[PDB]
Every structure is written in structure tokens, then in C-alpha cells.
Amino acid sequence: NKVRTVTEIVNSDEKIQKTYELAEFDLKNLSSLESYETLKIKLALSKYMAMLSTLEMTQPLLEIFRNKADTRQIAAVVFSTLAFIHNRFHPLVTNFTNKMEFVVTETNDTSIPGEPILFTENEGVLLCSVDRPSIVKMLSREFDTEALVNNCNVRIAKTFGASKDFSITEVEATQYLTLLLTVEHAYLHYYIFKNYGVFEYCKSLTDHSLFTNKLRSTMSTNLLLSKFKFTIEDFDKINS
Amino acid sequence: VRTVTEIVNSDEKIQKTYELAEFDLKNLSSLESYETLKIKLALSKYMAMLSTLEMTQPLLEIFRNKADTRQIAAVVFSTLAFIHNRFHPLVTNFTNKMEFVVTETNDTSIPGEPILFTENEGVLLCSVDRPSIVKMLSREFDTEALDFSITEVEATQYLTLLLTVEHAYLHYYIFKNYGVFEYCKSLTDHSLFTNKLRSTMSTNLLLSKFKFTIEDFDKINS
Amino acid sequence: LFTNKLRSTMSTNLLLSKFKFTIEDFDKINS
Amino acid sequence: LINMRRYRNAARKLIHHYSLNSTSSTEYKISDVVMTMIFLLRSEKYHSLFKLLETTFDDYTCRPQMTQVQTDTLLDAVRSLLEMTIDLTTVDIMRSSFARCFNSPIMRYAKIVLLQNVADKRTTLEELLIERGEKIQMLQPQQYINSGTEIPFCDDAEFLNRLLKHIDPYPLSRMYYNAANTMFYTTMENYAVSNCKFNIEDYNNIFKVMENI
Amino acid sequence: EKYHSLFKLLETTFDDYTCRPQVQTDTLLDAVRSLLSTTIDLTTVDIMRSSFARCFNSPIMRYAKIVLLQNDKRTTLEELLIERGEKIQMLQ
């Protein structure tokens, strides 16, 4: 609220009193927090793409995914992405189960809605279901990197107070963000798997609210997505 | 209020009641005359100052001019610093560095506040919309209703530009003393200037010499 | 203003003060 | 016949008032509008302006579109009439004011109003502020003021006294009137051209703040 | 063109109603009757002329205006005496 700090000299009763609107300093705190979060997210993406480049990815991700034949590359990239995510949740950890396998789904008969990437252990080791057509169409989706997406007074304040080379655009930034988010959700599912059993994996897949139960205990002790809040436009009426 | 004077030795008393209304009238007349005088003096000093800014060409076209922006920046600094000195008689000097940017279109002219300030992370920038202020000064004036060559119309022009730079300077003061967040809400709401200035300036204002209104304001809001 | 100003002088006079004067029919003039 | 000068000057006066350059506020009557519109009818060099008046008479919810040469001729004719600068925005103000005057029925008073029906997407003040910030802060300043530049006070005391006496007869109050009206006009014009909601309420709050402090 | 006489009449009626000063009287009466039907004379001609005259001088829609409005603290003795005495000193 308000703080009225008193400046005076004990020699005489002469006293001075300044009210201090804590709102401005809370706003400075919020602005520093948002800047730091943006920086950390952008540097996580920078590290991810840099290690992808060190992964001898020649053709950009888009036509890596268009590539049906080079399943070697698909397995390498998915393994690297899941490694990066687990390292994000486990900076100490940088390597996984010795043996790993990858399986690709190339049709509706093989591809599931909601979770194009899945896992179902062969009872000895976990296998990486990956729906190439789904991500192919995902990235193929035209993108909106021009129309900015969103309290009005504080917005004006942050605007005016805000005193505003290898070939890459912001479109591939969108692409890599989308890949990281999808693999993040899938890796959360697989965390549920490894930590509680295949049945619990299945139920969490059926009920993502169970991720709150199983990761409010662990993950929060956060998500890349948790930087912002997300919903559906006019979700209230949508629900009805 | 009444006063009595009477002979101490005698019951005779000659009481004269004195009317506070006449005294109040005399004070009001003296105050209005003095206010007129002092405002005229401040305006005369300001015109003398801009004369000592060394421009033969007169103010209206000193704005109309497109290419001429060095004199634009100089005069804008002079006006803002003159206002600063008026509110701060001690101060005769402003920040070491200043920058000016000359907006010349609607998409760069924010309505109501053609003049504004925002930092470039090193210094504050005087955004100025020459078209808006030029059309402002180009309007014919009611200089009739109720040996340097000056005109009543030019006096209106000086009063105009002074009030414009004065409001811009109030916004700039909000900026400096309260951050851009307070700057932007004061822009969004000028009633906040009351709270900000009762703290500082009241401890006055040329515009406070008069109270202004808008005819039919109530029904125009409707 | 004359009342105010002449309370100093006139009180210590006017011939016109004799009668009481008004203008006719204010009730339905000023209406 | 009729007197050219009276209709001509009536048209000039009305166009000045609705163009808002003539901050001198003066009453108007159906007589004045009749005189102005008769002038426009009879003025061959302003026949384009008169046909624009005829369009304003109509539903007036859609500005007629004119060739570029038509726009230039319209501007030249209005500049000849007002005897100037002028632009298309002032013409839009003309069009809206004339149309709304037509929409005023025969009446014994005047309905005070404010600029509107000009400029199409409706914009708000807050995101307009944000957008103008976007535009301004991308512009590198051209102008440099170096050092703690001393404010050049004109200590030419004789010059101060001479200016004071020269402006002394000036009726100080009326310069306030003119300037205040002119700032009000600037504010309304900028809000209307941007099509932003004119917050006349906070404009009044400015004077409230002035009064209180 | 047939009504130009009464048009001159009306254009003169603007501002002040001015005044009304034989074949042309018949012409204007026939013109008005065609504008009507009913019989007429100069009396209704002048009544209509008045209607138009008043209509002209009738007010119309106007816009707003920054209306002028011609409008406790008392200086103490010590500062007043400071400023009086300093200029007393400056006297020769």
C-alpha cells in the first residue's frame, strides 16, 4: 500500500515524511521478473537449437519431419529433445536408459489425437511413439508472427517506460517452441509412467488434472509453459 | 463587524460600523489588477527571451517551417526550461543532454498531447507533432469579443504555446518525479495532477488565474 | 453597489427614500 | 439579382466556424446557412464545393469519392474562398458539420455538439497511446542539445518594458479566451481524426486540477 | 424563374423583415396558387413571407466553446517587510 518514511534530525523536532506508493516498486519487481523469464526462456531455446545444430541437423526441422526415410534423424532429434527437457527438470541428469527405441506413426490408424507422441513399454524398455504426419501438419500450419497477442493503464506504462548472423526467422522460433511444448507434455506423461506405472500413465493421459497431483509435488519444486497463463477465448460460454 | 469609540469620561458614544464588503471589494480589485500585471510581466519576459533566442522569423512560421528543426529544438528547450525556472526560480539551467524528434503525421500525433516525452534509455526525448501545433496556432482568434511590432493575436499565440508547453511540462514533471507508470496514468487521467501538485507546486499556476468551462458540457457528455 | 458604498456617507440625505417604489405586476411579469 | 459580397462573406464565415480555425464563436441562423449555400450555388469556381454540399444534404453516412484532380480543385476553391493551410481533413469537418446542420430541424435554440462522424475504425485512448509509443520510440532523434545550455534570459530590461507597454492595452482575458478555445479545438480535432473517443471529461478535469491547485 | 419575384422578397426578408413595397402581383399570386389550389392575396403572401423571414433568422445547431469565467492565503508581516525594506534600501 503506502509507506511514510520519516527523515529527521534528533537535534530538533524538525521532521519530514514521505509517502511511497509501493505499487511502482511492485511494478518494477514485475517488470524485472518478466524480463528475466523472457531471457531464460529465450536462452533455453538458444541452447536447444544450438545443440540441435551440433546434432548435424542440415535441413531445418520442418523437412527433417517431411523426411520419411531418415528415421535415424527422427530418433536422434526426439531423443535429444527429451534429453534436453529432462535436463531442464534435472540439470544434474544428462543421460538416460542405456537402450532406447523409437516407433513412428504415419496414418490415422496409427496416430492418436491429443498426444501424437506416446510411449508403451515392451515390458523391458520404453519405446517412443512419434506421429510424423501430425508434426508435419503442425509445422506446415501457417503462422502469425506479426499480430501481437495479449490492465490498460499498466500496459501503457510498460509501453512508454519500455524505452524501445545465421539465417533464421521468428517462424522457426515458433516451430521449436511448439516442438518443445509438445515434447514437454509428452515427457510429463512419461514421467507419470516411470514414476507410478503404466496404469497411472494411462489415467494421467485420460486426465491431465492428475499432472497437478503428481507434479505439484515434484515439478513445482517450474514449467516453460508456466511463464504465461493460457485458456480458450470466451471459454466460459464455450463450455456451455 | 463594528467598532466603537466613545468619550471615556462621558456616556456619549459614537459607534461606527465598518462593512467588510467594501474591504473585500478593494482587496479583490487590487488582486485582480496585480494578477493581470504579473501575468503580463511574465509574458513580456517570455517574448523577450524568445527574442534573445535569435530568430528574426516569427513564431507561427517558426513552426510552419519543415526543414528548420534546430531552431525548433532550441525554442522547445527554451520554453520548457523557462517554465521550469518559473516553477523553480532558482534554476536557470536544465539537464546537460536533450534530444528532440519531429513527428509530422496523424499516426505519430497522439491526440490531446502532441508534445510528450519518453526516454531512449539514456536521455528523454521531446516528441513534437509540428502539424498539430501549427494548425493550433493557425486558427483565427477572437481578439475582439469580451517600437517592436507586436499584435494582440501574437499575444494569444504566445499564451497558447506557453500553455501547451506548460501542460507538457506538467506531464514531464510527473515523468521525472514518479516514473513512467505515473507519467502514463497522469496522461490517462489529469485529475491525478491535482494530487501530484498539491504535494509539490502548491507548497502558483498561471492558468489558475482563471476558471474555464465548456458550454453545455453536461449534455455534451450525454 | 450604491447601498454598500453610501452606507459610509449617505446614512450620516436622499429625498427619493420617502416613498416605497416597485414596478407593476412582478408576480406575472417575472413569470 | 443578389449581392455577391454578402453571400460570399457569409459562406466564408460559416466555413471558418465549422473548420474551427475561427475560434471566434458566433451565432448562426438558417439565414446564415441560406446565404452560404446560395453563395456556393452561384459560385462557379466553388460549384464543386456546392455539389459536395448537396451530397452532405443526403444520407451523408458515406463520403463521396472524388478523383485526385477533383480533390485538388476542391482544395484550391476552398482556399480561394477562405482566402488562406487547408487539407482534406478540414473538408471532412465541413462535410460532417454541414450534414448535421441539415439534420437539425427548425428550432429556437442551438444544440451544442462535438466532432464526430469523421475517421472509420473506432479506436480507444489507451491502445492509441500504446500505438503512438510504438511509432515514436522507433524514431532516432535528429536534434541535439549539448551541455547544460543556459536558458537565454533576455535581461534587456528596456526591451521588457517596451514589450510590456506595447502589449499592455491588450485585453489579457480575451487572449485567454482565444487560446483556451484553440487548445480545446486542437484536442477535439486530434481525437476525431484518430477517431478516438474524445475524453472531454478529463479535459475538464484538467481545468479542475488547475483551479484546485 | 416564375417565383423569382417572391424569391427576391424572401432574400430581402433575411436579417430584418424589411418591408413589402400590379401585373406582377397577379403573376406572383398565380404562381403561389399553382404552388398550392386555394385562392390567395397579398395578405397570405406576407404571412408566408414572415414565416420564411423568421425561419431564416431562427437559430440552428452550434458546437461547444471554452467559456470564460472571471474569477484565503494572506502574506504575513515578516516577508512583506523584507520586500518593502529591500526596495527602501535600493532607493537613493
Swiss-Prot record, chain C:
Localisation: Virion membrane
Subunit (UniProt): Interacts with host mus209/PCNA, cdc2 and cdk6. Forms a complex with proteins C42 and p78/83.
Reported function: Acts as a cyclin-like protein and plays a role in the modulation of host cell cycle. May promote G2/S arrest by interacting with host mus209/PCNA, cdc2 and cdk6. The cell cycle arrest is characterized by an intact nuclear envelope, concomitant with sustained activity of host cdc2. However, viral DNA replication still occurs in the arrested cells.
Family of this protein: Belongs to the baculoviridae E27 family.
Name used for this protein in its record: Occlusion-derived virus envelope protein E27
Taxon lineage: Viruses, Viruses incertae sedis, Naldaviricetes, Lefavirales, Baculoviridae
From Swiss-Prot, chain E:
Presence of keyword Glycoprotein: no
Protein name: Protein C42
Keyword Transmembrane: no
Chief place where the protein resides: host cell
Top-level lineage group: Viruses
Keywords: Host nucleus, Late protein, Virion
Signal peptide: none
Entire protein: shown range: 156 to 258 of 361
Subcellular location: Host nucleus; Virion
Function: Plays a role in host nuclear actin polymerization by recruiting p78/73 protein that is capable of activating an actin-related protein 2/3 complex to initiate nuclear actin polymerization.
Family: Belongs to the baculoviridae C42 protein family.
Oligomeric and partner information: Forms a complex with proteins E27 and p78/83. The interaction with p78/83 mediates nuclear translocation of P78/83. Interacts with protein Ac102. Interacts with IE0.
